[PDB]
Design a binder for these strands. Structure first.
Ligand SMILES: [K+]
Ligand SMILES: [K+]
Ligand SMILES: [Mg+2]
Ligand SMILES: [Mg+2]
Ligand SMILES: [Mg+2]
Ligand SMILES: [Mg+2]
Ligand SMILES: [Mg+2]
Ligand SMILES: [Mg+2]
Ligand SMILES: [Mg+2]
Ligand SMILES: [Mg+2]
Ligand SMILES: [Mg+2]
Ligand SMILES: [Mg+2]
Ligand SMILES: [Mg+2]
Length: 235
RNA sequence: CGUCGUCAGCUCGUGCCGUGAGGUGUUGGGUUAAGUCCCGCAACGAGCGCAACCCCCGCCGUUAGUUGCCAGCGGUUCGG
């Protein structure tokens, strides 16, 4: 909540090409063939975005974090592994929201196989199944790791790159689910309800924004949590 | 019942795409006898198939000696 001057590395955008003209309002200028985000409008939108986040958090709402850019995977896997908001990390399966019932059936199979490997029924029905179901539970935990926490449809979603995760954005629009997103120059701002005009490539921007967001979430529900152990993931 | 044909296929549920017939899934890369499996993917699963569970032939054991053997000894019209 004090990220005014500590925003080191967020103003960096993508190149001159691969941009979206609809983002021109959130751009300050172009330095050395690279779009640089407007520093003022960044916090201008951050006010309203974080205010919506606090309102939805203190009401007890669930937010789905979505990240697949391979630069925010290890960060989302723990910033959402804090206060119990679910997440999707490896890839966004088509129909996680519109076909939410079938994916919940997949989650049922996940916890069923978890109950099988907890019961003494592991050894019966010989080793063929002990390998098949082992690999099946492996991949189910690989994909539905954070998604298993959703019992109903989420009240909002959080996206790291709305261009790379455009399918989740589209499904959220279809179901009238608010779309919080960390938008860059390559993204369409109209599809994002609450926009965060920052960098989606640099690890520091993602760590800063997501850490402060989860800190605001836990601050809305009381019991301020220690700083997130995602700094060591700078590497 | 024969046949394409023991051929590797044909579909469905939900979601998504298209005004619509339809598509996606079932395409792709690797692999297999196989839509067999792996990886990827607006798809996620499922059914009839494939395969397996059935029978026979292959090695061994347990249970049982009106089939078998000087394996073992005795008798032998010396033919278990
Ligand atoms: K058209
Ligand atoms: K193939
Ligand atoms: Mg065959
Ligand atoms: Mg269909
Ligand atoms: Mg057409
Ligand atoms: Mg239609
Ligand atoms: Mg169809
Ligand atoms: Mg087809
Ligand atoms: Mg096709
Ligand atoms: Mg099959
Ligand atoms: Mg596929
Ligand atoms: Mg007899
Ligand atoms: Mg006998």
């Amino acid at each position: 909540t004090v990220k005014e001057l500590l925003e080191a590395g967020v103003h960096f955008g993508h190149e001159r090409k691969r941009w979206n003209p609809k983002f021109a309002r959130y751009i300050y200028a172009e330095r050395n063939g690279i779009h640089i985000i407007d520093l003022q409008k960044t916090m201008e939108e951050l006010e309203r975005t974080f205010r919506f986040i606090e309102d939805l958090a203190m009401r007890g709402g669930t937010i789905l974090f979505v990240g697949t850019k391979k630069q925010a995977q290890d960060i989302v896997r723990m910033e959402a592994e804090r206060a119990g908001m679910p997440y999707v990390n490896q890839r966004w399966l088509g129909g996680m929201l519109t076909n939410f019932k079938t994916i919940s059936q997949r989650v049922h199979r996940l916890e069923e196989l978890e109950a099988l490997f907890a019961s003494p029924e592991i050894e019966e029905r010989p080793k063929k199944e002990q390998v098949r179901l082992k690999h099946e539970l492996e991949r189910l935990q690989k994909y539905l790791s954070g998604f298993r926490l959703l019992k109903r449809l989420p009240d909002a979603i959080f996206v790291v790159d709305p261009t790379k995760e455009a399918i989740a954005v589209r499904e959220a629009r279809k179901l009238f689910i608010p779309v919080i997103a960390l938008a860059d120059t390559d993204s369409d701002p109209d599809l994002v309800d609450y926009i965060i005009p920052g960098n989606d490539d640099a690890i520091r921007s993602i760590q800063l924004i997501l850490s402060r967001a989860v800190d605001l979430i836990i601050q809305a529900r009381g019991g301020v949590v220690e700083p997130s152990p995602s700094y060591a993931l700078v590497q």
